[PDB]
Amino acid sequence: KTVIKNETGTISISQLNKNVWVHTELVPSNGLVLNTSKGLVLVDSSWDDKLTKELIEMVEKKFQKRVTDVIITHAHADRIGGIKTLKERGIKAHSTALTAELAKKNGYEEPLGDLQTVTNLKFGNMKVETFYPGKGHTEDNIVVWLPQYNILVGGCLVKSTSAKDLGNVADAYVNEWSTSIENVLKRYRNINAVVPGHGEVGDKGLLLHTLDLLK
C-alpha cells in the first residue's frame, strides 16, 4: 500500500485500492478519500479549517480533480471542524438531520442534513451507503459502506486494536453502543476492511474489540 505525506507529517494518505484511500491527520484521526470519475469525495474532513484546507489541497493536486462532497459522520469537532472551509468552497457537506442540528446547537455551520437512516449515493462510478445504526460514541454517529469493495468506515463508533478503552464518553451511550455495533454486524455480514475513527485499519475484529471494550 502506497503512503504519501504532506511536507510536515501532519497529513498522510494511504492507498486501500485503485480508488479508495485513507486520510490521517494529527491525536490521529482517519477518513477516506474516494477517487471517482466525477470528483473526489471525502468521508470526513479534519480537526479544524487549517488541516481541512491542507487535506483538500493535497488531494486535488495529486488526483487532478476537485473535492465535490464530504460525508460528515458525527458532529464532534474532529469530524465537523472544517465545515466553514467546505461551505465557503462550495463542497457539499452531507450529514443526517441530527448531525446537523447538533452542529448548529454547538456553534458550527450546518451540513446538509440530507442523510436518512439508510442512504444510497452514487458519485460517478462509486457507490456509497450511509447507515445510522443507533447511538454509541455519540447520539448521531453514522457508518459508511462501500458495497463495491466491502469496506466499512466505522468512525468513532469503532475502536482500533490499539485502543484499550472507550476514550471520550461524555457524549456516549454505553448501554446502546453494543446494540449499535450489532446492527452494523447484522447489516454487513462480509467485511473486507474496517477503518476505525482513530488508529490502524482492521477487519470485523475491530467491531468485536469494541464490543469487548463495552463490557
**Catalytic residue check, 94:** no
**Stated length of the chain:** 215
**Catalytic residue check, 137:** yes
The three three-digit cell numbers of residue 187, written as one number = 447489516
Q: Which residue, 135, 171, 147, 11, is CA-closest to 82?
A: 11
Regarding 156 and contact with Co ion (CB under 5 A), the answer is: yes
Between CA 160 and CA 153 the distance in angstroms is 12
Q: What are phi and psi of 58, to 5 degrees?
A: -65, -45
Select from 10-18, 120-128, 175-183, 196-204 the region that touches Co ion (CB under 5 A). 196-204
**Catalytic residue check, 168:** yes
User: How many CB atoms sit inside 10 A of residue 173's CB?
Assistant: 17
Regarding 76 and contact with Co ion (CB under 5 A), the answer is: yes
Catalytic residue among 23, 94, 137, 209: 137
Select from 12-20, 55-63, 76-84, 89-97 the region that touches Co ion (CB under 5 A). 76-84
The Cα angle at residue 64 between residues 58 and 65, in degrees rounded to 5: 95
Regarding 80 and contact with Co ion (CB under 5 A), the answer is: no
* Residue selected from 31, 136, 154, 197 as contacting Co ion according to rule CB under 5 A: 197
Under the rule (CB under 5 A), what is the footprint of Co ion?
76, 78, 156, 197
The set of catalytic residues is: 74, 76, 78, 137, 168
